[PDB]
Structure formats: structure tokens, C-alpha cells
Design a protein around this ligand. Structure first.
Ligand code: YZY
Ligand code: Y01
Ligand code: CA
Ligand code: ZN
Lengths: 661, 8
């Protein structure tokens, strides 16, 4: 009825004299400790540990007392890890004095611990002693052997090294240019989280730390000349392009960089109501062909130089695409019309006028791909869409020529086979029209209202496919079951009214007769477009019809009462996390869009497209001042927590006592 | 390995 309590693992008991010694050391009594040390020296332990494991030097370090610390250091030995304990507490005097069971993993070195503490003064003190830190590897024989010998130690050592390397103080102190080092280190740490799945959080935190350090270093500029020097440094805005390559979104979206980019973008438009802006945009767009011919004839003329402005060039490109879409509208109305019975018809007028635009788009896309390379082309999701639409256009053009060559006579439409080339050409043309009209979504990024919504929608598309996978699995299961049940009662087309078979008839029938038809029927029941009498059978077998109706009802419940609402909930959760960063991502996308019109390579719109020492010296001077303000800034920003002035006041009393004796 | 350096 009682539980005894005993000490299962007991340490060596300390003697009474040692206990008094340790109590005197903790109490900070110099006289008693000095007398105890003297009587121990002349009578004969100095290196005893308390149950917590702290030797007398450790308590001296923890008590922030220098006098008895020197007292033991003069008489005692076995410093051990006292330097690490002094560094962790961030005491400058004790660390300097030391330079002049363990709580730490054995691979820790003083420099890496100082980097971990992110103390600039201690790091600077240690660096002057010619210390060095190993460079971690990226897959050799040694790496493999160490992994087999001890995986835990290997991973922990790598993590410790990478935490030491990612300290802002170390980068600010021992790097030629901290901005490029921060960019590269952040990218490398980001790539490491995808390989080391177990420790992903730590690596993402380190990469975020590097990005924040780079942005904060950029934040210290005080004049426009310094900003230009930093942004234009080359090892054209080379630094901005390097930041874009490394996905430095916080760095790029800084207000000063955005102001400079907006100044470059709205050149020739000083002080850019919205109605006046709309009128100016429409007026410039209406005159795009004349500007294009003016640029073609003579770039030296003022009219030729007029299109070189990025904003006017963007307006001209948008106007050209809008003209192409409008002329696509004309074809859909079939103003010219066709006999409909010509098996191969010559192209109408509208098709001839359309033809140059398609060739210009193909030329632009192929030139872009050739210049960028395969990898850059694969990186852009919009480029894939352009490739698909251009392939569809090419297929339509080839099929029209094939149909014209193959056939010479005329025939009524109702007699042609289903795979006639003309029908495929028309279907592909319609699909290409639909795809071409949807390309205007990529222009929403230039608007302050529409652009954030476009970015957020793009960010949430990953999870929708994740749900469509589960929906496809459930649909396949239920389609298999229903087709297995209902395939014994297939009828013929001639046995139905109007000779129509399937669910696209006036009266739906044969809904679950074939697997393809079962999939089509189950797809359309999501929108309530499948009627309920399709579960009936001509033979009137009530058990089979009841089972089929129950299967259909179970599918309806699962698909509409459960999965749709879970999709709603997950979309709600994902959007909230995404919303906190919408502005930064939108501005990153917008500055990506702006920079594509800065070059002079593609000035012509698509229809007409067919016809060094002193730099480094200045960069170092600005970097020397940016780092100086950074270390000053975050110390004062860390003074929101500095109430230790009174403890220093006690140090003043101690200095007065030292002057006294 | 990389050697750290600071760049009466
Ligand atoms: C990814 C997988 C997720 C799975 C999630 C499952 C969640 C729970 C759902 C279970 C499915 C239930 C299947 C049996 C009922 C549906 C079939 C049916 O009624 O057959 C009709 C057939 C043919 O008319 O008739 C019967 O089976 C008899 C009449 C049943 C009438 C009462 C139904 C009670 C249950 C109603 C649930 C309503 C849910 C939405 C409420 C807003
Ligand atoms: C449904 C039918 C009527 C077609 C709809 C077409 C729109 C989806 C597209 C066509 C032209 C596009 C516009 C073309 C150019 C601009 C200017 C662009 O801003 C600027 O470059 C100028 C500065 C400014 O006004 O903010 C912002 C997006 C916007 C309004 C675009 C928004 C999307 C628009 C209206
Ligand atoms: Ca492209
Ligand atoms: Zn190696």
C-alpha cells in the first residue's frame, strides 16, 4: 500500500570540507575560498564536481566573478571546456582571461560556438587568433565511410557547421561581399532541406535567416548613389538579376529598389485621374502600327526612339495581341462564310490576314527558347502553354494543306467519315481559339488589383490536383462496379427513338453499358445533369435496379457531401497561410514582368517581327559603411531588452574598490 | 577549409 522511494543511480558523495568549499565558492566569499585553497595546498580535492557536475571553475564562470577565477587559474589545472561555458554566457572578460561529463557535443569548437551565439565582439576576438572552420562537402569515399560508421554524429556535425556558417556576424566579418555569400548560402541551404527530410525545418530556418540578413543589409542605404552602386555591381542591374535568379523575393521587393524600377519603367511619363491614363493608353495603342514602321525605317529618328521606352513597348505588344484576338472574333462570326460542301476549301480572307500573326508567334517562341535553353524554357509554366498553342496552330495549318491536296471534288457533309481531315482541322482551330483567348491572364500581373489574386490562384493549384487524384480513384472504383452490374442489358442504337444511344440524347439511355460511357455518366452527375430513370432496365428486375440506385446514391453522397466540403476546408486553410505574403510575391512577379521589356532584342511586335577596378573599389566603400550601420542598428534594437545598466554600476563599485586597494 | 579574417 506504499511505494518506497530510493536513489537508483547514486553518485560519489562529497566530503563535508568539499561541500563547505563549494558553498563558499558559490557565496562569493574571497577570504574563505582563499584560505580553503591554501589549507588544501599545504594539507591535501581542487578538481571535485558537485552532483550537477560543475567544478569550482564552472561556478566561478557562472557567477561572473573574475577575482576567484584568476585565483583558481593560478593554482588549479584542468581548464577543460571552461572556454565554451564562458562563450555561451557571453562574458567578454572571462573569455579574454581564459584565452590569455560535458554539456557540449565533442565536435563543437570555440569559433563555431561563438558563431552560434551570434556575438560580434566575441567572434571578432576569436577570429584575430587565426582560427579556421572546415568546409563541408556536397559525396566522396570519406563521406560514405563516415556515414556507415556513425550517421547521427555525421548529420549533427554537418548541421553544426552549417549553423556556424549562417551567422550574420560571421558573414559580416569574414566575407568579401556579404550579399553574394548570403544569396549563395541561402540557396544551398534551401536545396539541402529537400535532401535531408528529417531536419528540413532547421535548414528552412537557416535559409530564411540568410535572406533576412541580405534584406536588412540592403535596408541601410541612405542615398541614391549607394543604391545604384550596390544594385549595378558586376563581379544593367546585374545584382538585381542575380537576386532574381536565386529567388530573393524579400530583397527584390524592397521599397527603394521598387522606386528605382518604377522610375526606369515609367520613363517619358512624368507624374503618371485614371480616365486620363486610360485615354492615353488607348491613344498609344491605336498608333502602334505607325510606331512599328517608324522603328523599322529609322531607329535614329525620334519616332524610332519613341518605342524604345519599356512602357510604350508593353502597350504596343498588348495592342497587337488585342488586335489578333479581335480578328479571331471576326472568324467566329463567319462573315465570309463557306459553301460547307467543299471537301477542301481554299483559305478565306480572314485566315490569310491571321496567318502572319501565327508565324510571328512561332518565330518569337522559338527564338526565346533557343536563346534561353531547354532548362529555362521548362522553368516557365506559361512557355508550356505557348508551346501547346503553337503546336495546335501548326497541326491545323498542316491538316488544311493535306485536305486541300487530297480532295478536289465537292460532297455533302452528311456523307463524310468521322475522321475526315477537315473536321479535325475545324476542331483544332476552335480549341486553339479557346487557348489563345486564355493567354491574357498573364497580363493581370501589371495591375495592383487583379495581380495579387492571379498569384494567389497560381499558388493554390498544387493541392487541387492532390484532391483530383483521390476523386479519380473513387470515380474509377464506382465506375468499375456500376459497369460490372449493368452491362448485361446493353441495347442497340436502332432500338432507341431517334436512333440515339447514350446520355447525350433527348431521353438518356445506356448510361452504364460501357466503361467509357459509365465514366462519362458519373462525371456529369456531379453537376446534376444525369437523370434518375437511367437506373431502370427493360426487363424490370427490381433487385438489380435497387442495387444500382443504391450504388449511384452512395457515389453521390461520397462525392458531393464529403469530398467537395473537404476541398472547401483545405482551400480555406491554404489561402490563409498564402495571404500573408501576397504583396511580396506579386511584386516579385511584377518586377520579373518589367525586366522582360527592358532589353532591345524584341522591340518589334509579333506581326511586324517577320519583316573595372574602380567598380570594385566603390563597391567595397559602400559595403564598409553598410556593415557598420548594421551592427550598430540591431544592438540598439536589442536594447528593448537591456536593463542590465545597474549590474554594470556594481562593476563601477568593484573598480572603485580596486582603486582603493 | 576557409580561414576567417577581418576584412596609451
Ligand atoms: C474517400 C471516401 C470517403 C467516404 C465518406 C463516407 C461518409 C459517410 C457516407 C456514407 C454513404 C451512405 C450510403 C447509403 C445511403 C445512400 C444511398 C441511398 O440512399 O440509396 C438510395 C436507394 C435507392 O432509392 O434507397 C435506399 O437505399 C433506401 C432508402 C434510403 C433513404 C435514407 C438514406 C439514409 C442516409 C442518408 C445520407 C444523406 C447524406 C447527406 C445529408 C445532407
Ligand atoms: C472579356 C473581354 C472584354 C476581354 C477582356 C480582356 C482583359 C482580360 C485584358 C485585356 C487588356 C488587359 C489590360 C492591358 C493593360 C493593362 C495596363 C496595366 O497597367 C499598366 O501597365 C499601366 C499603369 C496602370 O494603369 O496601372 C495593368 C493591367 C491592364 C489594365 C490589363 C488588364 C487586363 C485586360 C483588361
Ligand atoms: Ca514564351
Ligand atoms: Zn567528401
Amino acid at each position: 500500500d506504499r511505494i518506497p522511494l530510493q536513489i537508483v543511480r547514486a553518485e560519489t558523495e562529497l566530503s563535508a570540507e568539499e561541500k563547505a568549499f563549494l558553498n563558499a565558492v558559490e557565496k562569493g566569499d574571497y577570504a574563505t575560498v582563499k584560505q580553503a585553497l591554501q589549507e588544501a595546498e599545504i594539507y591535501y580535492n581542487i578538481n571535485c564536481m558537485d552532483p550537477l557536475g560543475r567544478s569550482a571553475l564552472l561556478i566561478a564562470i557562472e557567477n561572473e566573478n573574475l577575482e576567484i577565477m584568476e585565483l583558481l587559474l593560478n593554482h588549479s589545472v584542468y581548464v577543460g571546456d571552461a572556454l565554451l561555458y564562458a562563450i555561451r554566457k557571453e562574458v567578454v572578460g572571462a573569455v579574454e582571461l581564459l584565452l590569455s561529463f560535458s554539456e557540449f557535443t565533442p565536435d563543437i569548437t570555440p569559433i563555431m560556438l561563438a558563431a552560434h551565439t551570434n556575438n560580434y565582439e566575441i567572434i571578432k576576438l576569436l577570429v584575430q587568433k587565426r582560427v579556421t572552420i572546415p568546409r563541408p562537402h556536397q559525396n566522396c569515399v570519406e563521406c560514405v565511410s563516415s556515414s556507415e560508421v556513425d550517421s547521427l554524429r555525421h548529420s549533427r556535425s554537418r548541421l553544426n557547421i552549417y549553423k556556424a556558417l549562417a551567422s550574420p556576424s560571421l558573414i559580416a566579418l569574414s566575407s568579401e561581399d556579404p550579399i553574394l555569400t548570403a544569396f549563395r548560402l541561402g540557396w544551398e541551404l534551401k536545396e539541402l532541406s529537400k535532401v535531408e527530410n528529417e531536419f528540413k525545418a532547421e535548414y528552412e530556418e537557416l535559409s530564411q535567416q540568410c535572406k533576412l540578413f541580405a534584406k536588412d543589409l540592403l535596408d541601410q542605404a541612405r542615398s541614391s548613389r549607394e543604391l545604384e552602386i550596390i544594385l549595378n555591381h558586376r563581379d544593367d542591374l546585374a545584382k538585381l538579376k542575380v537576386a532574381i535568379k536565386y529567388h530573393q523575393k524579400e530583397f527584390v521587393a524592397q521599397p527603394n529598389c521598387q522606386q528605382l524600377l518604377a522610375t526606369l519603367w515609367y520613363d517619358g511619363f512624368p507624374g503618371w485621374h485614371w480616365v486620363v491614363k486610360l485615354l492615353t493608353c488607348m491613344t498609344i495603342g491605336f498608333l502602334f502600327p505607325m510606331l512599328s514602321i517608324a522603328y523599322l525605317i529609322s531607329p535614329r529618328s525620334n519616332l524610332g526612339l519613341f518605342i524604345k521606352k519599356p512602357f510604350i513597348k508593353f502597350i504596343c505588344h498588348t495592342a497587337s495581341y488585342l488586335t489578333f484576338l479581335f480578328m479571331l472574333l471576326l472568324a467566329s462570326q463567319h462573315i465570309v462564310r463557306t459553301d460547307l460542301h467543299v471537301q477542301g476549301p481554299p483559305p478565306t480572307v480572314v485566315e490569310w490576314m491571321i496567318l502572319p500573326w501565327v508565324l510571328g508567334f512561332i518565330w518569337g517562341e522559338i527564338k526565346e527558347m533557343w536563346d534561353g535553353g531547354f532548362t529555362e524554357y521548362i522553368h516557365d509554366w506559361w512557355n508550356l502553354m505557348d508551346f501547346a498553342m503553337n503546336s495546335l496552330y501548326l497541326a491545323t495549318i498542316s491538316l488544311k494543306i493535306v485536305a486541300y491536296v487530297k480532295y478536289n471534288g465537292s460532297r455533302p457533309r452528311e456523307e463524310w467519315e468521322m475522321w475526315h481531315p477537315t473536321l479535325i482541322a475545324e476542331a483544332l482551330f476552335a480549341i486553339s481559339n479557346i487557348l489563345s483567348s486564355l493567354r491574357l491572364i498573364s497580363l493581370f500581373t501589371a495591375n495592383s488589383h487583379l495581380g495579387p489574386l492571379q498569384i494567389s490562384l497560381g499558388r493554390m493549384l498544387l493541392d487541387i490536383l492532390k484532391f483530383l487524384f483521390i476523386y479519380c480513384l473513387v470515380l474509377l472504383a464506382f465506375a468499375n462496379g456500376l459497369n460490372q452490374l449493368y452491362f448485361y442489358y446493353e441495347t442497340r442504337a436502332i432500338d432507341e427513338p431517334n436512333n440515339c444511344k447514350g446520355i447525350r440524347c433527348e431521353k438518356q439511355n445506356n448510361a452504364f453499358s460501357t466503361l467509357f460511357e459509365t465514366l462519362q455518366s458519373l462525371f456529369w452527375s456531379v453537376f446534376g445533369l444525369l437523370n434518375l430513370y437511367v437506373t431502370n432496365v427493360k426487363a424490370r428486375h427490381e433487385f438489380t435496379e435497387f442495387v444500382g440506385a443504391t450504388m449511384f446514391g452512395t457515389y453521390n453522397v461520397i462525392s458531393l457531401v464529403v469530398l467537395l466540403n473537404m476541398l472547401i476546408a483545405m482551400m480555406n486553410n491554404s489561402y490563409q497561410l498564402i495571404a500573408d505574403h501576397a504583396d511580396i510575391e506579386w511584386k516579385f512577379a511584377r518586377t520579373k514582368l518589367w525586366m522582360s521589356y527592358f532589353d532591345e532584342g524584341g522591340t518589334l511586335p509579333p506581326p511586324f517581327n517577320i519583316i573595372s577596378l574602380i567598380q570594385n573599389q566603390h563597391y567595397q566603400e559602400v559595403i564598409r559603411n553598410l556593415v557598420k550601420r548594421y551592427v550598430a542598428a540591431m544592438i540598439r534594437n536589442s536594447k528593448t531588452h537591456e536593463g542590465l545598466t545597474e549590474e554594470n554600476f556594481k562593476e563601477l563599485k568593484q573598480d572603485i574598490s580596486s582603486f582603493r586597494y | 577549409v576557409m580561414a576567417l579574417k577581418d576584412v596609451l
